[PDB]
Amino acid sequence: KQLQLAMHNSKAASSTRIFQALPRKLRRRTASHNVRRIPKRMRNRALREMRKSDKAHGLNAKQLYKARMSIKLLRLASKSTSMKLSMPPEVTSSNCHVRQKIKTLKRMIKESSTANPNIKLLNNRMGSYDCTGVNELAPIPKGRVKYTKRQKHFAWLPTHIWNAKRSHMMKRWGYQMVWAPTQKCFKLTHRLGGDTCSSDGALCMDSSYIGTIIVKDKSNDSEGDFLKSIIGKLTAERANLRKYREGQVLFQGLIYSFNEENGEDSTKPLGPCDVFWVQKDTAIIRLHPSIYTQVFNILLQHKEKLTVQDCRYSLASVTLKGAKALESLASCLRSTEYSKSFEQFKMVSMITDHNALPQRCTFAFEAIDPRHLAAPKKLNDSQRKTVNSDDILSLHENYPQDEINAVFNELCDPESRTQSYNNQNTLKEISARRYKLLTATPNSINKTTVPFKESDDPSIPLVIIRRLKTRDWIVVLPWFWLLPLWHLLNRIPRMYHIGLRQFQQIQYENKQLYFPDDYPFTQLGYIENSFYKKEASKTKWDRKPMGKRINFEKIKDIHNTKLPAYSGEIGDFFSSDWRFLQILRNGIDYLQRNDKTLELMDSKKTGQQGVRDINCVNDVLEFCKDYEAKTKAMSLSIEENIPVALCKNRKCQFSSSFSLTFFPRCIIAVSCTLLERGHPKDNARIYQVPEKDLEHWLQLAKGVYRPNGRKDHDLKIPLPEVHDLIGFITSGTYHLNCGNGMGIGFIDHHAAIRQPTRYVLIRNVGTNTYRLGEWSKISV
Amino acid sequence: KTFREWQYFKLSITSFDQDVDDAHAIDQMTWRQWLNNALKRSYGIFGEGVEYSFLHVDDKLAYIRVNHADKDTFSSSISTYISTDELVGSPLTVSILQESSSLRLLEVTDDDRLWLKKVMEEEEQ
Amino acid sequence: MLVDLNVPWPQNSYADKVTSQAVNNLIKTLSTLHMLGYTHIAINFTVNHSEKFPNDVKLLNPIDIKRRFGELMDRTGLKLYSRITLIIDDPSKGQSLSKISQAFDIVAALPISEKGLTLSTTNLDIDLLTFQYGSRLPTFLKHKSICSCVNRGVKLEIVYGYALRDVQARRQFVSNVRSVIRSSRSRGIVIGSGAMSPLECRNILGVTSLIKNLGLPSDRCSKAMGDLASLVLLNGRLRNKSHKQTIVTGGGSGNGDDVVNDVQGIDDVQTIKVVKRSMDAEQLGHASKRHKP
Amino acid sequence: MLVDLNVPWPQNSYADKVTSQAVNNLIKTLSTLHMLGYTHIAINFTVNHSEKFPNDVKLLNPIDIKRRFGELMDRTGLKLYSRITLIIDDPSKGQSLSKISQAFDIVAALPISEKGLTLSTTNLDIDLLTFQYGSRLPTFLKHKSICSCVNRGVKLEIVYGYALRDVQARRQFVSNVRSVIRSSRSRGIVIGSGAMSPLECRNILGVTSLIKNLGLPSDRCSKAMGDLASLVLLNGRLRNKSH
Amino acid sequence: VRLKSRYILFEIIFPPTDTNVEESVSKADILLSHHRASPADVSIKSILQEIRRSLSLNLGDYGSAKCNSLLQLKYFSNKTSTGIIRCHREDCDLVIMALMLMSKIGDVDGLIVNPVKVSGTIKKIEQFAMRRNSKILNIIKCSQSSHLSDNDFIINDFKKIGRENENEN
RNA sequence: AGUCUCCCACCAAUUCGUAUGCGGAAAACGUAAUGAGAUUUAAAAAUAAAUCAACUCAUUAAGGAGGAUGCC
RNA sequence: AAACCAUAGUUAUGACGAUUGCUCUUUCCUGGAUCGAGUAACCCAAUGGAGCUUACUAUUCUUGGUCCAUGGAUU
């Protein structure tokens, strides 16, 4: 305890060095100092169990459970220290050795019910096997009995027990997935997972919730040609072409639901899809859980000719985003033999800007148990630093086709990945193996990683693919192997895990859609819009005292001239209402059947065969008001008023069938950027720019300056009519990649193809301020 | 929506003795030295610019109008000044009998209020 | 109502007697305060804790309201209460608050030290806590030890008589007042007026003008010398007329019949109230079903 | 930018010429004002509106802005302007301002008596109005006189110079400024600075407080030396299209 | 709650205001002439005394007591006349009024007291002062070769005022 | 806001391998049914102490099959 | 030598203007127009989250219920 040794230690430093306080993401607070407390229900049972004193001699009907749980109670209350029952109950003051060892364990349980058949123990000392259903669905994988009881309705991912301690969870679509971590991450997500060049880290997401369907033909001929028809029908004629089959590049598009079996048939978009072809007669399909079953049963209509494996409980995947992503993954993977596909992986893990790489960058090989390393380690890459654009062109010719196929086909076969577990090691025996390295023969090495045996250790097949549209890396692995890998991947000093909200933000920044929230032309996007968000908003609205919330139907000067139908704001206050858009636009179009000049209102013509005349626009608005709260708030009806843009041309249309809800009105998807102040939130409205005041708005766009020299903002803002509504905004916030507010939304198709300019007006819900913006198309 | 220009007072008291109170204060040139002395003792040179108008002074019940923005100043100082041997040996004081903002309250049997009523309206000129 | 909680009784301590001129000045200023519109008037007393109180318990207060100011109460119909304030400088000096709280109707203590401030906020039976605003306050006012004594039966008092006396004391008054309203969160406060002559008195419209300039709003300043001082009087009067605020020796219904509103009717020497037996057991049990009052 | 537009030019009438020490003092005070932060500056000039104006179209503005100060419009970026302060006392004596309009940029007026004050707001060609805050303004001025002119394109001016010279003038200044503020309902007020010396100038972020603690709202204190003072200069320069 | 505060950074300019000088005109020379040091007869007490004098005359008792409750002079340097003062948030304008309406500190005459910025925290006025000194040094070393200002009135001062008296956390 | 709990490294097993009415990764956490007590008590000060409410405590594994009470 | 990292981030959240809501109310014709007052109390981040425990809304900002509590009218 002499400071002389402290001075000697500091002699390896300066005289008086100064150390910083910890960064705020690496700090923890002190918990309590006394031992933990047991629940009372586990105390009473144990106390009453120990206080108890002690026709084929079994006679154990429903008493087997009582014995098998009394044993656990006795063990717990004889082992744990936190158990403070009373003074008398002890290990020896009451018969605990005699009980449950020579009284219950063998005399009672063993002598009543003989062990059931299937005594095939396992090839493992850790429960690890396959859960696949050939031509049928599969159940939850068996595991710990306590934690398999809670998965009766919503399943678990392999990492759930790990994420639950560090995130906010939710429950949807039969899974208990992760929503967002417990720290603010708005800017860090952008500058580590966005398209910036300031990235010094990566983002990893456990996307095991996305299913996997391995479909394959059974004609025994490698030419197939019938799975081709199924895949070409399932989507548009896209995913069966020379680019995707022979070159085996990944596919991302839209997946339909064909039903052609008797005369009249149609199709309805469902959502995104990932189709990967292998050897021209095997296909892998990845789908969002919500549309998993509906397509699946469709394939089951032809299982006479194909074969399907619901392997969603046997294959896991992880998604990686960022610049230094492959560098971090390559720090926790080694091989068994020498393979060229690891040489390419070693070379390409040194790019740091993955947009330069070509369309196809598939890797596939066989790794060893990642628990050998005991610490992530670089690939000695600093030696070579003269990568140029000439070796990249070699990657398009030196492609190891056979070496990829051979290692790939060890994933589309259940018994192969069953052999993959042939001998999975426990933690203690790996520890002992590592300890045996302190007495090695080289005696001049001091190695840390354990060696690898030639045949008495398992080999893990592994695939890595690149998604171009989303710009990220998929890694596909067997299910039970995911947990050992994921433990190392989070020991990198600058690796962060993200939830589902961060995924939405990332795909928003890159001007791309998002299947759950931003597909109002799909059967489930429409439900999420008009049935799930609206309830969540109204429940917290009408449950505030009046006057402490925004009044919606009492707003002044919204439009240039006021129609007495709606006192305040137009449409529903809580969601992007598309039914009103369809009815209003169709009525506006019909009001110009042969009278080009519309007209707003005639002063008190009359009140109303159930006549509903179509004279004035106020009549259209009151028709829309009538159709709601009195036709679908007391009954049900389903229709898809929102199609998607089609390559064909069916623009125009026209007392027999003149209903205002019978024809779908085509729209397109756009992104609008604001030239001046503004901050578009969700559900805001998008108006066309009136022919009058076009010069004023153009002048505002060019710039109007005060005598001081700044910009002029406080002027007279002119207003448009109510029949100038052409679109809605479904996602919008401050866009950090450009520094100005930006939104993404949908606009009516026929509106844009008649604008003499490229400007629109944006206003939120519950406000009367009109901001200017310019819109650009999104190719989706 | 609204605007206020003037504030009207009704303030009157002297030393609470009546034996010396018979030396009645002169009309205005003692109700003008006293107020200036108060507004100087309480606030400095910046406490001189308060512009106030005498409306129909009386024997003791003086009436005053002051700017809207000086109500904070005036009422704070007149209530905290106590003179000494200024005009007579007896120190004086003020008590604010009433305050208003419309000049339409608390007048008894008078003709002066006919003036300051309509001829001096805002006139939109 | 309208109430003033401080009018200094002219005397140093139990040593010297009071001259007649001071008493006549007190009568004149009392009449002036009545003229301004005040109904209940207190009368203060200032003694230091480090001095002997007389052993004979009868002489613990020489104000003697019942027979010094009878005629003024006859004409003006005023209500007069006695009050005492004690200087607290050093604890462990004897002379507990047992008997001095018996003869008086309100007991208050002003501290002039750290130990005094600690003692006079957690472990005393006082009902008013005051400082000396014409000097330097002993301590920076902690934000927690003042707000945690308001929740007991203690209140703070502001006296504006220091704002009309001299020139150097005005700065100290402004600073200390700002400090007190800042630290106490401005919840329980009352206002008195240590006037030594009729010249220094002010009415309700001329006491809010000063205080509103030091931060306090107007409505709270109106409630200051309103029901709050009435509650102070109630706490002061429920200490010798009841056991633990549970059994008072008061009277019946009718306006102006309470333990504070009634001063003449209660024999304070014996603390009884003999009244005409007008209510018996054989009469109808309602308001109007029986008609005889 | 900051605009201060009441720097005086050392000349009393059309007879005398400018000496050396006067211009030497003017250059120093201009340099100091440039240091404190001001960029745009105007130069004043006082006449009596009842004197023999030079008949020729030249030498009626002896400022001579393009020869003098030529080494200050470069080597430092501050720009300079010209103005004249007519003093109006009588409702007559001709000399209509159609002549001197082309020879200046800013024309002001300094009424003295009631007839002059009511003439000034009646029909002239001024674009700014000023008062003698030194002492003894003709008091009891009401919204009636000022509303008509301020509704049109006219502005009021404060100088704050007299608050720096002597206490006796300071008291009159602080008395009259309150009246002029409350009579116009805080509309169209701008601030200049009467700098007779390189000592009587001041910064910005305090004089705004000097006007805010007298009655002007804090929203208007930030536009006196700013947008309004810029607009008056912009219009004055755009008047030069007479040619 | 907690009491707020405001910090004011005030300089002292010593203009020449003397005839028969005919100075040169350039951004370097004007600053180098107006920014001479203080004659050291002023002190930390003289400024406080003078700013108390200028309040009880241009304002009254209720104007000189709402500011004198909390008014402390923290840091002052003579090599460059910059100083820092502290006051209540709601009563800072009156101190500014005291600043302008005050000249002729003590016996020294012909000078201007110039408040240049006001801010809440103390950590930020330090950064502002550092940026101000850097800006002055940059503008004095760019007109020509820097050493034509060899008199070194201020050049050796900005570097050496780093944290010598600025350790008042 | 606080003199308070839990989480923010792993464990096929000297680490709470804890199927315990239900929810929860856990909690000095939430909630359902039946039933009972308050210094004379499992217990509080010398929450309740006419009724209902409030405080505290005791008991109650999921799935599926078979028969019956009541209504179609 | 660091690990320094927040759509509030270190004891900062400022000084003011112009409209619309809401509560009460003077006169009227989630009803419409007028006259005049309020928009509070409890309080404030310091690494983050899930819980619990306390403080508040006295014709002095507001909204909803229950009572084998009391007074009147129903009946």
Side-chain angles (χ1 to χ4, degrees), chain A residues 250 276 318 320 325-326 329-330 333 341-342 345 360-365 399 404 407-408 411 461-467 472-477 485:
Chain A
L250 193 148
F276 186 81
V318 178
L320 300 162
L326 272 191
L329 171 61
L333 279 184
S341 290
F342 195 84
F345 173 73
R360 173 184 66 192
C361 277
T362 299
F363 299 142
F365 61 97
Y399 186 45
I404 300 299
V407 65
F408 182 76
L411 292 181
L462 186 45
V463 177
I464 303 186
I465 310 171
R466 157 154 177 271
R467 297 184 289 175
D472 61 10
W473 298 99
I474 313 188
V475 60
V476 171
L477 182 78
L485 163 79

Short mmCIF file of all heavy atoms in Angstrom, two decimals, chain A residues 250 276 318 320 325-326 329-330 333 341-342 345 360-365 399 404 407-408 411 461-467 472-477 485:
data_model
loop_
_atom_site.label_atom_id
_atom_site.label_comp_id
_atom_site.label_asym_id
_atom_site.label_seq_id
_atom_site.Cartn_x
_atom_site.Cartn_y
_atom_site.Cartn_z
N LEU A 250 -30.41 -10.92 -56.72
CA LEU A 250 -31.56 -10.82 -55.84
C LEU A 250 -32.66 -9.97 -56.48
O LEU A 250 -32.40 -9.09 -57.31
CB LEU A 250 -31.15 -10.25 -54.48
CG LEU A 250 -32.12 -10.34 -53.31
CD1 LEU A 250 -31.36 -10.49 -52.02
CD2 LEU A 250 -32.98 -9.10 -53.24
N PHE A 276 -35.19 -15.46 -54.66
CA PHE A 276 -33.84 -15.82 -55.08
C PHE A 276 -33.88 -17.18 -55.74
O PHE A 276 -34.36 -18.15 -55.14
CB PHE A 276 -32.88 -15.82 -53.89
CG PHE A 276 -31.46 -16.05 -54.26
CD1 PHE A 276 -30.68 -15.01 -54.74
CD2 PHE A 276 -30.88 -17.29 -54.12
CE1 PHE A 276 -29.37 -15.22 -55.08
CE2 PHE A 276 -29.56 -17.50 -54.46
CZ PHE A 276 -28.80 -16.46 -54.94
N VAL A 318 -29.88 -11.88 -40.39
CA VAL A 318 -29.52 -10.60 -39.79
C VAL A 318 -29.25 -9.60 -40.90
O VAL A 318 -28.65 -9.96 -41.92
CB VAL A 318 -28.30 -10.72 -38.85
CG1 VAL A 318 -27.93 -9.37 -38.28
CG2 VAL A 318 -28.59 -11.69 -37.73
N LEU A 320 -27.51 -5.94 -42.04
CA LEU A 320 -26.45 -5.00 -41.69
C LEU A 320 -26.50 -3.79 -42.61
O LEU A 320 -26.68 -3.93 -43.83
CB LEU A 320 -25.08 -5.66 -41.78
CG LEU A 320 -24.86 -6.87 -40.87
CD1 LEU A 320 -23.68 -7.68 -41.35
CD2 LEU A 320 -24.65 -6.42 -39.44
N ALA A 325 -19.57 -1.98 -42.27
CA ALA A 325 -20.40 -3.12 -41.89
C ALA A 325 -19.68 -4.44 -42.13
O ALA A 325 -19.53 -5.24 -41.20
CB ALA A 325 -21.72 -3.09 -42.67
N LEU A 326 -19.24 -4.69 -43.36
CA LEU A 326 -18.54 -5.93 -43.66
C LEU A 326 -17.22 -6.03 -42.90
O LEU A 326 -16.76 -7.13 -42.60
CB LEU A 326 -18.30 -6.05 -45.16
CG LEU A 326 -19.45 -6.69 -45.92
CD1 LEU A 326 -19.03 -7.02 -47.33
CD2 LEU A 326 -19.92 -7.94 -45.19
N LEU A 329 -18.32 -7.51 -39.53
CA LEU A 329 -18.74 -8.91 -39.65
C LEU A 329 -17.55 -9.81 -39.93
O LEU A 329 -17.47 -10.92 -39.40
CB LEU A 329 -19.79 -9.05 -40.75
CG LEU A 329 -20.17 -10.48 -41.13
CD1 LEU A 329 -20.76 -11.19 -39.93
CD2 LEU A 329 -21.15 -10.45 -42.28
N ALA A 330 -16.61 -9.35 -40.76
CA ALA A 330 -15.43 -10.14 -41.09
C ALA A 330 -14.47 -10.28 -39.92
O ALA A 330 -13.51 -11.06 -40.01
CB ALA A 330 -14.70 -9.53 -42.28
N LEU A 333 -15.43 -14.11 -38.18
CA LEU A 333 -15.70 -15.25 -39.04
C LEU A 333 -14.40 -15.78 -39.61
O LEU A 333 -13.60 -15.01 -40.16
CB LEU A 333 -16.65 -14.86 -40.18
CG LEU A 333 -18.14 -14.82 -39.86
CD1 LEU A 333 -18.94 -14.51 -41.10
CD2 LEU A 333 -18.59 -16.14 -39.25
N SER A 341 -14.10 -18.05 -52.30
CA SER A 341 -15.16 -17.16 -51.85
C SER A 341 -14.85 -16.51 -50.51
O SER A 341 -15.52 -15.55 -50.14
CB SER A 341 -16.49 -17.90 -51.78
OG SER A 341 -16.96 -18.20 -53.08
N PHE A 342 -13.88 -17.02 -49.76
CA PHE A 342 -13.39 -16.27 -48.62
C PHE A 342 -12.28 -15.30 -49.00
O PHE A 342 -12.13 -14.27 -48.34
CB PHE A 342 -12.88 -17.20 -47.52
CG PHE A 342 -12.71 -16.53 -46.19
CD1 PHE A 342 -13.77 -16.37 -45.34
CD2 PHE A 342 -11.47 -16.03 -45.81
CE1 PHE A 342 -13.61 -15.74 -44.12
CE2 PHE A 342 -11.31 -15.41 -44.60
CZ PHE A 342 -12.38 -15.26 -43.75
N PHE A 345 -14.19 -12.34 -50.17
CA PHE A 345 -14.78 -11.69 -49.00
C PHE A 345 -13.74 -10.91 -48.22
O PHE A 345 -14.02 -9.83 -47.69
CB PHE A 345 -15.46 -12.74 -48.12
CG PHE A 345 -15.94 -12.20 -46.81
CD1 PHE A 345 -17.05 -11.39 -46.75
CD2 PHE A 345 -15.30 -12.54 -45.63
CE1 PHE A 345 -17.51 -10.91 -45.54
CE2 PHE A 345 -15.75 -12.06 -44.43
CZ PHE A 345 -16.85 -11.24 -44.38
N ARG A 360 -24.08 -7.73 -58.21
CA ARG A 360 -24.06 -9.03 -57.54
C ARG A 360 -22.80 -9.15 -56.70
O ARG A 360 -21.69 -8.99 -57.22
CB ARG A 360 -24.13 -10.15 -58.57
CG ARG A 360 -23.95 -11.54 -58.00
CD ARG A 360 -23.94 -12.57 -59.11
NE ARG A 360 -22.78 -12.42 -59.97
CZ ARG A 360 -22.64 -13.04 -61.14
NH1 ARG A 360 -23.59 -13.85 -61.58
NH2 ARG A 360 -21.55 -12.85 -61.87
N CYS A 361 -22.96 -9.44 -55.41
CA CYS A 361 -21.82 -9.64 -54.51
C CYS A 361 -22.09 -10.79 -53.55
O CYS A 361 -21.84 -10.68 -52.34
CB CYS A 361 -21.49 -8.37 -53.74
SG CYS A 361 -20.46 -7.20 -54.65
N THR A 362 -22.61 -11.90 -54.05
CA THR A 362 -22.96 -13.02 -53.19
C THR A 362 -21.72 -13.71 -52.63
O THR A 362 -20.75 -13.96 -53.36
CB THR A 362 -23.80 -14.03 -53.96
OG1 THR A 362 -25.01 -13.40 -54.40
CG2 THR A 362 -24.15 -15.22 -53.09
N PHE A 363 -21.75 -14.01 -51.34
CA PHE A 363 -20.75 -14.83 -50.68
C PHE A 363 -21.43 -16.03 -50.03
O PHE A 363 -22.58 -15.94 -49.60
CB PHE A 363 -19.97 -14.06 -49.61
CG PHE A 363 -19.22 -12.87 -50.13
CD1 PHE A 363 -19.15 -11.70 -49.39
CD2 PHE A 363 -18.58 -12.92 -51.35
CE1 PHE A 363 -18.46 -10.61 -49.86
CE2 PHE A 363 -17.88 -11.83 -51.82
CZ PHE A 363 -17.82 -10.67 -51.08
N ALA A 364 -20.71 -17.14 -49.94
CA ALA A 364 -21.28 -18.34 -49.32
C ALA A 364 -20.15 -19.29 -48.95
O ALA A 364 -19.36 -19.65 -49.82
CB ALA A 364 -22.26 -19.02 -50.26
N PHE A 365 -20.08 -19.69 -47.69
CA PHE A 365 -19.01 -20.60 -47.28
C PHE A 365 -19.41 -21.31 -45.99
O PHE A 365 -20.58 -21.35 -45.61
CB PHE A 365 -17.67 -19.88 -47.16
CG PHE A 365 -17.64 -18.78 -46.14
CD1 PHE A 365 -17.16 -19.01 -44.87
CD2 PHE A 365 -18.07 -17.51 -46.46
CE1 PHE A 365 -17.12 -18.00 -43.94
CE2 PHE A 365 -18.04 -16.50 -45.53
CZ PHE A 365 -17.56 -16.75 -44.26
N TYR A 399 -16.01 -15.76 -60.80
CA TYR A 399 -17.13 -16.07 -59.92
C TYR A 399 -17.15 -17.56 -59.62
O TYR A 399 -17.29 -18.36 -60.56
CB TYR A 399 -18.44 -15.63 -60.58
CG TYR A 399 -19.65 -15.78 -59.70
CD1 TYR A 399 -19.62 -15.38 -58.37
CD2 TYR A 399 -20.83 -16.32 -60.19
CE1 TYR A 399 -20.73 -15.51 -57.56
CE2 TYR A 399 -21.94 -16.45 -59.39
CZ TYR A 399 -21.89 -16.05 -58.08
OH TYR A 399 -23.00 -16.19 -57.28
N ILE A 404 -20.08 -21.98 -54.62
CA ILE A 404 -21.25 -21.38 -53.98
C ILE A 404 -22.40 -22.38 -53.93
O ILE A 404 -23.08 -22.51 -52.91
CB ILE A 404 -21.66 -20.08 -54.68
CG1 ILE A 404 -20.53 -19.06 -54.64
CG2 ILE A 404 -22.91 -19.50 -54.04
CD1 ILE A 404 -20.12 -18.66 -53.24
N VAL A 407 -21.97 -25.29 -51.16
CA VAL A 407 -22.20 -24.85 -49.79
C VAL A 407 -23.61 -24.32 -49.59
O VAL A 407 -24.12 -24.35 -48.47
CB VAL A 407 -21.17 -23.78 -49.38
CG1 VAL A 407 -21.35 -22.53 -50.20
CG2 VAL A 407 -21.29 -23.47 -47.90
N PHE A 408 -24.25 -23.84 -50.65
CA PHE A 408 -25.62 -23.35 -50.52
C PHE A 408 -26.59 -24.50 -50.30
O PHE A 408 -27.49 -24.40 -49.46
CB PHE A 408 -26.01 -22.57 -51.77
CG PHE A 408 -27.38 -22.00 -51.70
CD1 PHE A 408 -27.63 -20.87 -50.94
CD2 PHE A 408 -28.43 -22.62 -52.34
CE1 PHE A 408 -28.89 -20.35 -50.86
CE2 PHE A 408 -29.70 -22.11 -52.26
CZ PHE A 408 -29.93 -20.97 -51.52
N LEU A 411 -28.32 -25.83 -47.02
CA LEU A 411 -29.35 -25.10 -46.30
C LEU A 411 -30.76 -25.47 -46.72
O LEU A 411 -31.68 -25.33 -45.91
CB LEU A 411 -29.18 -23.58 -46.50
CG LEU A 411 -27.95 -22.95 -45.86
CD1 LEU A 411 -27.95 -21.46 -46.14
CD2 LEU A 411 -27.94 -23.21 -44.37
N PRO A 461 -22.80 -23.87 -42.35
CA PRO A 461 -23.03 -23.20 -43.63
C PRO A 461 -23.50 -21.77 -43.40
O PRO A 461 -24.14 -21.47 -42.39
CB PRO A 461 -24.11 -24.05 -44.29
CG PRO A 461 -24.76 -24.78 -43.18
CD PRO A 461 -23.71 -25.01 -42.15
N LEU A 462 -23.17 -20.89 -44.34
CA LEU A 462 -23.42 -19.48 -44.13
C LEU A 462 -23.52 -18.79 -45.48
O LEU A 462 -22.69 -19.03 -46.37
CB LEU A 462 -22.29 -18.86 -43.30
CG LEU A 462 -22.45 -17.42 -42.86
CD1 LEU A 462 -23.84 -17.23 -42.34
CD2 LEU A 462 -21.44 -17.10 -41.78
N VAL A 463 -24.53 -17.93 -45.65
CA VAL A 463 -24.71 -17.20 -46.90
C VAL A 463 -24.81 -15.71 -46.61
O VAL A 463 -25.38 -15.31 -45.59
CB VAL A 463 -25.95 -17.69 -47.67
CG1 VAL A 463 -26.16 -16.88 -48.92
CG2 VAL A 463 -25.80 -19.15 -48.01
N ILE A 464 -24.22 -14.89 -47.48
CA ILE A 464 -24.29 -13.44 -47.39
C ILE A 464 -24.70 -12.90 -48.75
O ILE A 464 -24.08 -13.23 -49.76
CB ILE A 464 -22.95 -12.82 -46.95
CG1 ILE A 464 -22.51 -13.40 -45.62
CG2 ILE A 464 -23.08 -11.32 -46.86
CD1 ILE A 464 -21.28 -12.73 -45.06
N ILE A 465 -25.73 -12.05 -48.77
CA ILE A 465 -26.26 -11.50 -50.01
C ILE A 465 -26.39 -9.99 -49.83
O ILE A 465 -26.41 -9.48 -48.72
CB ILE A 465 -27.62 -12.13 -50.40
CG1 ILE A 465 -27.53 -13.65 -50.37
CG2 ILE A 465 -28.01 -11.75 -51.81
CD1 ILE A 465 -28.86 -14.33 -50.51
N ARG A 466 -26.46 -9.27 -50.95
CA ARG A 466 -26.54 -7.82 -50.95
C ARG A 466 -27.85 -7.36 -51.60
O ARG A 466 -28.16 -7.76 -52.72
CB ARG A 466 -25.36 -7.20 -51.70
CG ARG A 466 -25.61 -5.80 -52.21
CD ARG A 466 -24.32 -5.03 -52.35
NE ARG A 466 -24.53 -3.70 -52.92
CZ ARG A 466 -24.53 -3.44 -54.22
NH1 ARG A 466 -24.32 -4.42 -55.09
NH2 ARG A 466 -24.73 -2.20 -54.65
N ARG A 467 -28.60 -6.52 -50.88
CA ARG A 467 -29.84 -5.94 -51.38
C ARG A 467 -29.55 -4.54 -51.89
O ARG A 467 -29.14 -3.67 -51.11
CB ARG A 467 -30.90 -5.91 -50.29
CG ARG A 467 -31.33 -7.26 -49.79
CD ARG A 467 -32.46 -7.15 -48.78
NE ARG A 467 -32.04 -6.58 -47.50
CZ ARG A 467 -32.89 -6.30 -46.52
NH1 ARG A 467 -34.18 -6.53 -46.68
NH2 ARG A 467 -32.45 -5.80 -45.38
N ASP A 472 -28.26 -2.83 -48.39
CA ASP A 472 -27.82 -3.44 -47.14
C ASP A 472 -27.37 -4.88 -47.38
O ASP A 472 -27.41 -5.38 -48.51
CB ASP A 472 -28.93 -3.36 -46.08
CG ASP A 472 -30.19 -4.09 -46.49
OD1 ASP A 472 -30.18 -4.83 -47.49
OD2 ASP A 472 -31.21 -3.91 -45.79
N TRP A 473 -26.92 -5.54 -46.31
CA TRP A 473 -26.40 -6.90 -46.39
C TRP A 473 -27.30 -7.84 -45.59
O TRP A 473 -27.55 -7.60 -44.41
CB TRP A 473 -24.97 -6.97 -45.85
CG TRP A 473 -23.97 -6.16 -46.61
CD1 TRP A 473 -23.49 -4.93 -46.27
CD2 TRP A 473 -23.30 -6.53 -47.81
NE1 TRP A 473 -22.58 -4.51 -47.19
CE2 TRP A 473 -22.44 -5.47 -48.15
CE3 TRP A 473 -23.34 -7.65 -48.64
CZ2 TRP A 473 -21.63 -5.50 -49.28
CZ3 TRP A 473 -22.54 -7.68 -49.76
CH2 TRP A 473 -21.70 -6.61 -50.07
N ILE A 474 -27.75 -8.91 -46.24
CA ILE A 474 -28.40 -10.03 -45.55
C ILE A 474 -27.36 -11.07 -45.21
O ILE A 474 -26.49 -11.38 -46.04
CB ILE A 474 -29.50 -10.66 -46.42
CG1 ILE A 474 -30.42 -9.62 -47.04
CG2 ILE A 474 -30.31 -11.64 -45.60
CD1 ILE A 474 -31.60 -10.27 -47.71
N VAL A 475 -27.45 -11.64 -44.02
CA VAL A 475 -26.69 -12.84 -43.68
C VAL A 475 -27.68 -13.90 -43.21
O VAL A 475 -28.48 -13.65 -42.30
CB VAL A 475 -25.60 -12.56 -42.63
CG1 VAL A 475 -26.18 -12.04 -41.34
CG2 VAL A 475 -24.81 -13.82 -42.37
N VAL A 476 -27.66 -15.06 -43.87
CA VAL A 476 -28.61 -16.14 -43.65
C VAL A 476 -27.86 -17.32 -43.05
O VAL A 476 -26.81 -17.74 -43.57
CB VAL A 476 -29.32 -16.54 -44.96
CG1 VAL A 476 -30.13 -17.80 -44.75
CG2 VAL A 476 -30.21 -15.42 -45.43
N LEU A 477 -28.43 -17.87 -41.98
CA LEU A 477 -27.77 -18.80 -41.08
C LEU A 477 -28.81 -19.78 -40.56
O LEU A 477 -30.01 -19.50 -40.62
CB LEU A 477 -27.11 -18.03 -39.93
CG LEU A 477 -26.29 -18.68 -38.83
CD1 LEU A 477 -24.90 -19.00 -39.34
CD2 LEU A 477 -26.22 -17.75 -37.65
N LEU A 485 -23.43 -16.32 -32.65
CA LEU A 485 -22.84 -15.28 -33.48
C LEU A 485 -23.23 -13.89 -32.98
O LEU A 485 -22.37 -13.03 -32.79
CB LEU A 485 -23.28 -15.46 -34.93
CG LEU A 485 -23.10 -14.26 -35.85
CD1 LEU A 485 -21.67 -14.14 -36.29
CD2 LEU A 485 -24.02 -14.37 -37.05
#
